[PDB]
Ligand binder design. Structure first.
Ligand SMILES: Nc1ncc(O)cn1
Ligand SMILES: Nc1ncc(O)cn1
Ligand SMILES: Nc1ncc(O)cn1
Lengths: 281, 281, 281
């Protein structure tokens, strides 16, 4: 199923009939960082499997719902169970949910993820406001927009120079200062590693040479689809480890360690993004 | 349809029966740089859709013709409407037209493209004679030759050390001097970005670190297929902008700007390559 | 055919019924480096085409056998005719033979390959004990584990920090010293170039900047599948040329030159790995 105008409209039609919510904000939460989705008011949960033309996710398994409702008086839509390209999903499957958000009226997309630290000033538990990216799949002919262009949504050759909105990064830093945890907030460049293997020690050393501050396996595909169709983005990474230090000390990383850091910061991140939603222009 | 010996011979058979032209020179022109194709004498236009085994291009749309005729007394064949891998074409679809050129007797392939400037000595409107490349898709398992080797055309493991003929670069520079625009002519290394997104600001900073002089979304796949089957190549890039300066100044690039630069240089480039064809050994 | 638990068990069942050998060591030999497979005692040769669920290799052609028997008193299994991803094989086809080795009881995998030299201290004919890698396909969304995870074999997000066993590198160096050819033995980082084109001169210059010591077109996919399911690996590269020197001198490389170096070192490498097998803990 192609992520074209007709197929996305069919999905959005079903969603409208069921929810009666017209959102202008969208949110995609990282693994272990989805608690805010349980605080949505007057909410409506829609499993992907019931939405026309939505991708099939049974092979991967686990939760997959679209959740609509109110937060801080604002109308939002959330992806509960996000799609990763290391699972084998195609460009079309990743893009369609984002283009459905567009047809529903979304103008701002907030994203969180877990990532490894490359910059030496980064430690486990820090936050990184993403200001740019290095898209290794894109350079290597696996860009999320490879294929026919869907002209109704955006141009053939999009410019990514302003994909990470400056004002939204400023508003997020301001809230960190009002609550006195700005010491945890950095900015940096995000490198996209297709995955699913964690970056090797020598791959981490390479990324340091190339000016990368963090590395992860998500986010960039959704950012490009949102920028293509004119949606503003804020993306924040939670640092689970510093891969450069681990390589120098012969220390390992694993998913169990990643999720422990997520649990330690989940509540502060929930509080942080709830206020962001409330304060959005 | 595979780009094998049998399928390419079928296409070349049709072309011979229709044109009566046996060319030894081939040309692939960049976007907005195809005016010379309208100056071909005693010409014959063949739309791709009528040639057996030629790839289907209706989804992408726009012009797609093979044009044969005479220029400067030399017999040539031109691709009017070239195939880009960011459209979703397979390795086999990109390769077959080049291997048809081979069976028709082509020994020299001239190529032009539009690209972004990485080297700080490059400005909008300059020309770059390509002397080598960095093939990011090739490193990442999307090389144009991934698949079974077609032994009739070339070896399993080709050497690209002489893919960009030295003498042809010299002849092109000589003509620039005779007409006194050598101040516009550089040489440099071409980085292949799969696309279709323009290189991001931080991707441009990375390419500077790696020794790249220009970046574009084409050319390298055709060069590799031509080098595989023993065809000499000259490739020239037209610089539409300097991506490093744009990143430092927070300036954008877009297709509308690219085509404006193409229009400003199209006539000088036509004059330039017409003489090259006439002067080829 | 997916490289899942059920399909791999079917293949291993056939192999058990035919050989009566239960190996705990596996070996994959590089091109021109397979002579040791002719020295296997009480051996049993099984062509891939007869083993259920094994990948089809007729298009590529050439030898493809699984060989079981005894070496130095140890029980081994060998892949005679290895699969390269530049031929067009899928992730599933590359992985299944390795996961069959696992179900047969393999705990150690020994691998040899031919590669180009990037580090300036490397010359034609040297050996390189691989201690890490840079996986360009993996960064670019062509990792061998892209797809659904086969939970019975390993985790979703494996850590590659210890994929190249330290003790095995030490044992291999020790044997080189006992026979007084340690002057040929280096250690270094292996860059994975998808291929099948040899690295271009400017790609070699890039890899030097990035800290790569050697470059080749194999090994990394098998290493990742073995590390995923808990198999220890030793990997050794034979250097056929120094790509940096060749680029500075405008010298070419080709397969004929590669195989000549392989012939010159094949007997010493056979002797070397026979003792390694005998001395494994
Ligand atoms: N901690 C971590 N490291 C790498 C990565 O891709 C995700 N998370
Ligand atoms: N001006 C420009 N920049 C990048 C590119 O790939 C093409 N053209
Ligand atoms: N000699 C050589 N060089 C490169 C390569 O990929 C294999 N062998």
């Amino acid at each position: 199923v192609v992520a074209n105008y007709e197929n996305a409209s069919m999905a959005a039609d079903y969603i409208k009939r069921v929810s009666n919510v017209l959102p202008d904000i969208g949110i995609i939460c990282g693994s272990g960082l989805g608690k805010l989705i349980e605080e949505i008011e007057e909410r409506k949960v829609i499993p992907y499997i019931n939405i026309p033309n939505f991708p099939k996710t049974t092979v991967a398994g686990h939760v997959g719902n679209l959740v609509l409702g109110s937060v801080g008086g604002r109308k939002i839509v959330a992806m509960q169970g996000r799609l990763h390209m290391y699972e084998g999903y195609s460009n079309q499957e990743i893009a369609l949910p984002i283009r459905v958000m567009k047809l529903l009226g979304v103008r701002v997309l907030l994203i969180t993820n877990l990532a490894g630290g490359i910059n030496r000033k980064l430690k486990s538990g820090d936050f990184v406001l993403i200001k740019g990216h290095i898209n290794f799949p894109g350079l290597g002919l696996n860009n999320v927009l490879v294929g026919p262009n869907q002209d109704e949504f955006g141009p053939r050759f999009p410019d990514l120079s302003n994909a990470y909105d400056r004002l939204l990064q400023q508003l997020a830093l301001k809230i960190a200062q009002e609550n006195d945890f700005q010491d945890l907030v950095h900015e940096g460049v995000y490198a996209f590693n297709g995955g699913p293997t964690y970056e090797s020690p020598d791959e981490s050393n390479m990324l340091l040479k190339l000016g990368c501050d963090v590395v992860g396996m998500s986010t960039v595909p959704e950012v490009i689809i949102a920028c293509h169709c004119g949606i503003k983005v804020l993306a924040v990474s939670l640092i689970a480890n510093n891969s450069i230090l681990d390589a120098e000390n012969d220390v390992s990383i694993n998913h169990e360690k990643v999720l422990a850091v997520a649990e330690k910061r989940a509540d502060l991140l929930q509080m942080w993004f709830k206020e962001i939603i409330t304060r959005l222009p």
